[PDB]
Design a protein around this ligand. Structure first.
Ligand SMILES: Nc1ncnc2c1ncn2[C@@H]1O[C@H](COP(=O)(O)OP(=O)(O)O)[C@@H](O)[C@H]1O
Lengths: 93, 99, 370
């Protein structure tokens, strides 16, 4: 189930994903495996779309925090006047 | 140095480190040493007793060729220009008595 | 330029001072002011009215000891001026307040007026060349040498926890309650009255402090020990009497872990630590739990650290290494940290010059408060 989504309003963003679904069932009958094939399909697709949405939900604090935090670990802004004015004590350990 | 040893042995690093850093003597001495050969053996006496214009010709060329070592000693711009005008001041004084 | 920075560690109960670079504070004495109560009759008596330091401690019976600072906030500035002036006297420093920059410890979350009027006092009556007000937790961590960790202090009038990350003391996680040593002594006085022994004189409250300093402990189980009758050890007064304490020795410092006994909606020390840690970045909780430093004289009770470990384990999440350090200089932690901080070359750029104070004013201090 490969997905490609592009968005470029005042920028550029591309979502590329796929889930290597793997499932099995014995071919019992035709109508049974037809709607059962749909059962596996509805399962994996509802699962996959929902999971993708929640991956978007947990992205401000996990993925981005792997790249760039929203706020530093001190949870405050930067006193540029402090860093430039004097060394924070980094020389001392 | 004994006083400095007193302050170092007494764990008071302030006056000891400031004795060399807060005093601008180190940087003053290094700039002094940068201008030290430039100030020794200056041919201004060649310009002093020069009444003949030919002596002044050769003197002027000699002084400037000795001054040519300011390429390696960072000479300032405005300082060099006031220097040149000072050279012209003494040139004018010599020419005044020459006339 | 000046001679050397003087690290004056304040404290609502014990002031501590000395020059920077010193190993231990050479000058420490209680932060009280005693003036006589009786009548001068015989000539040749103790001349002078206000006494501070060892002389005020010696002739303790005559004085009417009061405190000018309470809960890290100065209530009387005249007594504080005399105390600071006493620090610069011939009995403590023998120097002048004109050739020494001053490092000044100060508790967090205090009013702006403390820094403002204290700065006026120094730069105007003392005319110090440079003043620098700082926190106290930052100094205690500098004294231990490590750099990231919380600091749990409980001095005489305040108690707080500061999660420090490499020197940047996180200002959004400093919990602070006002239940410290002096208040524990006060509650101990109440319990001594309930025992039958009365101590109410101002120069007798100090005896109550002495009892707190050498006869109290912390029970591990707070209730199991209350349901038993202890051995009821005695106590010798300076007078020579005898006081059997009993249950009034473990319930007295119990106040720090439950300020319900004093009737207050504040929290215990353990809750101050856990809230100070939990109101921080989730990525630093394990590092903060692995580095807790105690300081302040109220952390000297018997069984203090052990009970703190038990309490924190009850509040911390499961299987997180909790580690509480407790150096041997909890009384001198902030001062030693001041000696390390002010003895650096960056302190020249870290203070506030007198010229700057005359130019901008108090706003310059709040600007360069860190
Ligand atoms: N052995 C002790 N046990 C319990 N409390 C003590 C002991 N020694 C001192 N104290 C209390 O601790 C206080 C000292 O803390 P202090 O140094 O005043 O902190 P700060 O100086 O930051 O106010 C004193 O008021 C005293 O009441």
């Amino acid at each position: 189930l490969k997905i490609q989504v592009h968005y470029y309003e005042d920028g550029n963003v591309q979502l590329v994903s796929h889930k290597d679904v793997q499932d099995s069932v014995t071919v019992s009958n035709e109508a049974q495996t037809a709607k059962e094939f749909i059962k596996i399909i509805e399962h994996a697709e509802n699962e996959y779309q929902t999971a993708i949405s929640e991956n978007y939900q947990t992205m401000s604090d996990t993925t981005f925090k792997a790249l760039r935090r929203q706020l530093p670990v001190t949870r405050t802004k930067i006193d540029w006047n402090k860093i430039l004015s004097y060394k924070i004590g980094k020389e001392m350990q | 140095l004994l006083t400095l040893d007193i302050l170092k042995h007494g764990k008071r690093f302030h006056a000891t480190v400031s004795f060399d850093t807060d005093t601008g003597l180190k940087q003053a001495l290094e700039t002094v040493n940068d201008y030290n050969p430039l100030m020794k053996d200056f041919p201004l006496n060649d310009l002093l007793s020069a009444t003949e214009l030919d002596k002044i010709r050769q003197a002027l060329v000699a002084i400037f060729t000795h001054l040519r070592k300011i390429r390696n000693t960072k000479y300032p711009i405005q300082r060099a220009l006031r220097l040149v005008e000072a050279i012209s001041r003494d040139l004018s004084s010599q020419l005044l008595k020459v006339l | 330029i000046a001679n050397q920075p003087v690290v004056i560690d304040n404290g609502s109960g014990v002031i501590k001072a000395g020059f920077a670079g010193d190993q231990i504070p050479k000058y420490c004495f209680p932060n009280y002011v005693g003036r006589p109560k009786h009548v001068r009759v015989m000539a040749g008596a103790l001349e002078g009215d206000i006494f501070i330091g060892p002389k005020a401690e010696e002739h303790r019976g005559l004085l009417s000891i009061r405190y000018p600072m309470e809960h890290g906030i100065v209530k009387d500035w005249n007594d504080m001026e005399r105390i600071w002036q006493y620090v610069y006297s011939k009995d403590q420093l023998q120097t002048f307040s004109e050739e020494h920059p001053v490092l000044l410890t100060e508790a967090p979350l205090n009013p702006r007026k403390n820094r403002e009027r204290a700065a006026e006092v120094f730069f105007e009556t003392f005319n110090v060349p440079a003043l620098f007000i700082s926190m106290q937790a930052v100094l205690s961590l500098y004294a231990t040498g490590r750099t990231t960790g919380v600091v749990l202090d409980s001095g005489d009038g305040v108690t707080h926890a500061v999660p420090i990350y490499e020197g940047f003391a996180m200002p959004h996680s400093i919990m602070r309650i006002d239940i410290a040593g002096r208040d524990v002594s006060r509650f101990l006085r109440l319990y001594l009255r309930k025992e039958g022994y009365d101590f109410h004189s101002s120069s007798e409250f100090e005896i109550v402090k002495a009892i707190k300093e050498r006869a109290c402990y912390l029970s591990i189980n707070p209730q199991k020990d209350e349901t038993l009758e202890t051995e009821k050890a005695q106590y010798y007064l300076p007078d020579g009497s005898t006081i059997e304490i009993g249950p009034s020795r473990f319930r007295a410092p119990e106040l720090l872990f439950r300020p319900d006994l004093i009737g207050e909606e504040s929290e215990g020390i353990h809750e101050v630590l856990v809230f100070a840690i939990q109101k921080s970045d989730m990525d630093l909780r394990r590092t903060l739990f692995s580095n807790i430093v105690l300081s302040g004289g109220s952390t000297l009770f018997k069984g203090f650290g052990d009970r703190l470990l038990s309490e924190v384990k009850k509040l911390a999440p499961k299987d997180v290494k909790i580690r509480i350090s407790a150096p041997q200089e909890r009384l001198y932690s902030t001062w030693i940290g001041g000696s390390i901080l002010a003895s650096l070359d960056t302190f020249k750029k870290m203070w506030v010059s007198k010229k700057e104070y005359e130019e901008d004013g108090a706003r310059s201090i709040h600007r360069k408060t860190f």
